[PDB]
Structure 1
């Protein structure tokens, strides 16, 4: 699962303080270093010798090979008595969903700053051939230093593992059409799917819910496949500037061939504005207390 794993009980180094919740899979615990007192988040997953180790192997590999200020910090992993423990940064404010349900709608400048920081994390991930595939407020954390960090590579790991399995059982390819060979090797979609999720997340930070949240999940999926499909928009026009409406319009470009990349989005009017600094986030954290 990981050549750098510690075959030791994490409870030798950490006091488990409380079960904070969970992600796509696993259970997350708040933990404290026994001697220093430093806080960490320990994600525990059941790991038997018979289980497929590929998903968790890929999640650890993404966390270990990410060296970025906009990606949650990784400290190491533990394997002890059929339980895998992934040790990561403990972000004191929690997720942006934890924040906006107490604080309400973020201001346009706070959203602009979060979007820029997320786009820097996405530009980095995409440059290293990775796709997050689960961009949303619940997966964007704010640490005590006011930094915006992408978290939960669970879906990304599951998708990488599913793609490796498909290649293993693809069979003889001599009669396969090139587009069949392409979805077997790449998947049918690309990293631009993360740009659309950031557009939906910016609406979620403004409205406390993604668009169509009240609509049945299957109806949402079917409508996206229909011919006359129109992407979502911000509900209250006058509350937001034209730069925010345009950010939603371009990130939510229906065709992936015309959806801008993460680096191209960094020069967009909304995220290239002058007043975007960590002070906006430190002031968001002050409102929480």
Structure 2
């Protein structure tokens, strides 16, 4: 809850976290980012040598701490092969640390922006994301922020979802959400046109991420977000630049992800059965694109 006190926030985090100081467990500190959500490092588990990613947050400068608690709890209880592994958390005064596996392959955004994926490689990424989405949805978790930025890549071509800061946890009692939380360009039209959306908003975004993999950008990226949202609600299913360049089974897959009618849009479970995913190259096929993008970036 947003009204929960500073001190009740701290007591709850104290109960979640491992005891003591995280330097008691890590060493390779390179800062790899900073900003509103906190500061990110790569580091090394001192004990095991595992490379990790660590976010450090000052709770004093954290506006919405309920969402940080939620994010860790969701990660902890929703472990999956296709979700970046949550390892540990520490609280030292007002300083919160969250430790994750590190994926040395970077973001899918780098890949879509610096290389040109083939349909075999696209099918493999979509499959792996749909594996995480089937698992989430069946556990009543909606990611709500699916986009290339939130897919991370191993050097072996592992595909892992990240950034559950905006996820919703639903129940049969309240199966639908209304909050507009996701990144504009990837938002399903029903997020703006109604006040009741479910898990299939993640399928829509997945479909937008497939357009990224084909074209390099989601539709309307050059638009102000405010215009993009009106455009999604009024254009509906986005149009491809060059649909003739795509295989018939890939075009069918995209149409199933980007169906205007939520009922008719595929669920993650249904789409795991799609024949487009059958042309998937081994995930190792992604390694030259990942290495080429790492190089460019």
Q: Give the TM-score category using the shorter length.
A: 0.7 to 0.9
Shift of 1:224: 3.2
Counterpart position of 1:137: 148
Aligned length: 266
1:32 and 1:184, CA in 2 relative to 1: closer, same or farther beyond 3 A?
A: closer
> Superposed, which structure 2 residues align to 1:1-289 within 5 Å?
1-2=12-13, 3-15=15-27, 17-21=29-33, 25-48=37-60, 53-102=65-114, 104-156=115-167, 159=168, 188-226=196-234, 229-273=235-279, 275-285=280-290, 287-288=292-293
Counterpart position of 1:170: none
Shift of 1:182: 6.8
**SS of equivalent residue, structure 1 residue 257:** coil
Shift of 1:48: 4.1
CA distance in structure 2 between the partners assigned to 1:267 and 1:37 by the alignment:
38
- The range that moved more, 33-42 or 79-88, is 33-42
1:253 and 1:235, CA in 2 relative to 1: closer, same or farther beyond 3 A?
A: same
- The range that moved more, 90-99 or 233-242, is 233-242
**SS of equivalent residue, structure 2 residue 132:** helix
TM-score normalized by the length of structure 2: 0.80
Shift of 1:77: 0.6
Shift of 1:272: 2.7
Residues 111-141 of structure 1, C-alpha deviations (whole Å, 9 max, x = no match): 1100000001000000111001111111111
CA distance in structure 2 between the partners assigned to 1:262 and 1:225 by the alignment:
23
TM-score normalized by the length of structure 1: 0.82
CA distance in structure 1 between the partners assigned to 2:243 and 2:177 by the alignment:
39
1:51 and 1:242, CA in 2 relative to 1: closer, same or farther beyond 3 A?
A: closer
Q: Is residue 37–residue 62 contact of structure 2 (8 Å, CA) maintained in 1? A: no
Shift of 1:101: 3.0
Q: Is residue 49–residue 82 contact of structure 1 (8 Å, CA) maintained in 2? A: no
CA RMSD of aligned residues (A): 2.9
- The range that moved more, 123-132 or 62-71, is 62-71
CA distance in structure 2 between the partners assigned to 1:100 and 1:188 by the alignment:
32
